[PDB]
RNA sequence: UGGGAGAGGUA
């Protein structure tokens, strides 16, 4: 007789993106861990509470092994004869009844061990939320930084967290405001945080491209390559399959409208549209820009150009403390050199 | 987490009103052994405390405390800010005090400051909406529109530039917005950081 | 009789002798482990 | 917890 599980199945049922055997699964490891602590001698008593019931019968376990340890599970092979060698080497299953009772140390642990599965449990629920989506630009705000990371939430009693690498370097997010990023790949057996979102990174500019731009919604426009320096630079390549619509108006729009929007969310970053070509001399004679190009040496075994260039455009060929050739190395994948 | 059961702490003895009291145990933990706890943790994490108690109105001398530290932390930190690392000695060190007190000033603002709760919510951030109540039946709340939510008055950023510029009146504010502002957001920031911190290395102390 | 002449008793034996039980498996079992002493 | 009376005692 157990009103409490029917409570369970109805009146302490849980939040409703968290399924009933997970719960079954907390009460029965609650109460083997209640009997496993409270006998003196070292019995991992696993009790099987079977759910239409209630009650139960407790269980001591034993596990086919040829050691020397653990008695209480030390069951062999000539104990697996007692039901004739119908198992595996290893398995705990049981052979036995025991009594069971009640206690407020049990109750403590019981407690311990419960709010330790049902966070667990909001965990895996905070894994499907992340799993029916794999990658996308969403906002939250900020609700306690701390020195390494910057904790965030999606509603539902979500939560997120910026590290300390991805972010700009011109951040500044007192906690209250809506703030922009992408998770991307996150850990679901994390045991602290686990939603990894980031806002410095190439998959952060063209999310916010998907999201800002419908034809690379809808793939008529597409963009291929990316380049970054975090708050100052940025340079991505279009190509397009389409021959109606100009890939490069049509991303910097009305104006310069789509760049100065991703520039403003992004935070002042100078993002550099360029083309995207697939052959690799003709793509980089396109990709430095606005460098000028006299004569290219293109290497195929290291994978690097040589780049000869006239004297006057050298300080924004390279940018700022080499910043443009950097920027165009890891764009293109080949590494840039000087030659006049 | 952990941080706010000190600031209980440092309350004088108040009168209990109930039956049988006294537990008389080591359970959670005495009100002398946190103090020591607090000691024990200040040679790291003393920005934090120091904020922390300034910030809750709880001994009310830290709040100096908290406005040195952040004023060491801006004079650390001000050669990446274009507005502030190229002028001279004393008058770098006047302008980081004054947005020093004033960025600590906008990181003590919550509902208790004086003259800054809401009008409507009285600082809950929350009514009742009235039809959703007469559809519904049952009791509903929404956010206080007034208040947006956060249930009291922010602290305008523009107060720090009106104290600013009666000693750089040469600063306009579009250049205040442009290299002068994110000194301000790095200081009420790093007044967070260290708070967590400090909550951290405490609750590591008492575990 | 004696402890010396439980500890040759190998596993097998433990219970193909008749009427050692599980019950009564587990009742010389913890007690050869709150004595110290192992078998097998 | 912690307040007030009354009684006795020590230097
Ligand atoms: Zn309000």
Redesign the pocket.
């Given at each position: 007789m157990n009103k409490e599980i029917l409570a369970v199945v109805e009146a302490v049922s849980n939040e409703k993106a968290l399924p009933r055997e997970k719960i079954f699964e907390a009460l029965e490891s609650a109460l083997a861990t209640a009997t496993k602590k409270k006998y003196e001698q070292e019995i991992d008593v696993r009790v099987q509470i079977d759910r239409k019931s209630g009650d139960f019968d407790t269980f001591r376990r034993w596990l086919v092994v040829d050691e020397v340890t653990q008695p209480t599970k030390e069951i062999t092979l000539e104990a697996a004869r007692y039901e004739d060698e119908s198992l595996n080497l290893g398995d705990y299953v049981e052979d036995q009844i025991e009594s069971v009772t009640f206690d407020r140390i049990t109750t403590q642990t019981a407690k311990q061990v419960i709010v330790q599965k049902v966070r667990e449990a909001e965990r895996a629920m905070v894994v499907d939320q992340f799993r029916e989506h794999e990658g996308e630009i969403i906002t939250g705000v900020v609700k306690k930084v701390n020195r390494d990371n910057i904790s965030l939430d999606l509603g539902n009693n979500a939560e997120a967290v910026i590290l300390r690498e991805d972010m700009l370097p011109r951040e500044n997010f007192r906690p209250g405001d809506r703030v922009r990023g992408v998770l991307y790949s996150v850990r679901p057996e994390a045991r602290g945080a686990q939603l990894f979102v980031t806002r410095s990174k190439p998959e952060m500019l063209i999310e916010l491209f998907r999201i800002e731009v419908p034809e690379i919604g809808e793939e008529v426009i597409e963009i291929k390559a990316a380049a970054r320096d975090p708050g100052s630079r940025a340079k991505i390549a279009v190509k397009t399959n389409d021959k109606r619509i100009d890939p490069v108006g049509a991303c910097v729009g009305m104006r310069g409208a789509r760049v100065q929007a991703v520039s403003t969310e992004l935070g002042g970053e100078r993002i550099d549209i360029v083309l995207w070509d697939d052959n690799p001399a003709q793509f980089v004679i396109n990709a430095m820009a606005p460098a000028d190009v006299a004569s290219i040496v293109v290497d195929e075994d290291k994978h690097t150009m040589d780049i000869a260039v006239e004297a006057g455009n050298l300080a924004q060929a390279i940018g700022r403390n080499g910043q443009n050739v950097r920027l165009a190395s890891q764009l293109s994948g080949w590494e840039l050199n000087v030659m006049t | 987490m952990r941080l706010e059961s000190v600031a209980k702490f440092h309350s004088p003895?108040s009168?209990?009103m109930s039956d049988s009291?006294?537990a008389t145990a080591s359970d959670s933990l005495s009100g002398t052994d946190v103090m020591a706890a607090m000691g024990m943790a200040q040679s790291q994490a003393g920005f934090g405390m120091a904020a922390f108690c300034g910030k809750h109105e709880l001994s009310q001398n830290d709040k100096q405390k908290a406005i040195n530290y952040l004023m060491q932390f801006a004079h650390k930190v001000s050669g990446k800010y274009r507005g502030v690392a190229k002028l001279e000695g004393n008058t770098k060190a006047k302008v980081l005090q004054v947005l020093a007190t004033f960025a600590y000033a906008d990181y003590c603002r919550s509902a208790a400051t004086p003259g800054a709760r809401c009008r409507d919510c009285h600082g809950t951030g929350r009514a009742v909406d009235i039809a959703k109540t007469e559809l519904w039946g049952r009791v509903v709340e929404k956010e206080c529109g007034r208040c947006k939510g956060v249930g009291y008055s922010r602290m305008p950023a523009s107060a720090a530039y009106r104290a600013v510029t009666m000693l750089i009146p040469n600063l306009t504010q579009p250049t205040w917005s442009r290299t002068v502002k994110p000194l301000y957001d790095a200081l009420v920031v790093q007044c967070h950081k260290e708070e967590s911190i400090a909550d951290n290395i405490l609750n590591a102390v008492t575990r | 009789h004696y402890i010396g002449d439980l500890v040759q008793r190998t596993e097998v034996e433990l219970l193909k002798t008749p009427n050692l039980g599980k019950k009564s498996l587990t009742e010389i079992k913890d007690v050869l482990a709150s004595r110290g002493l192992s078998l097998g």
């Open positions: - | 003895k009168p209990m009291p006294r | -």
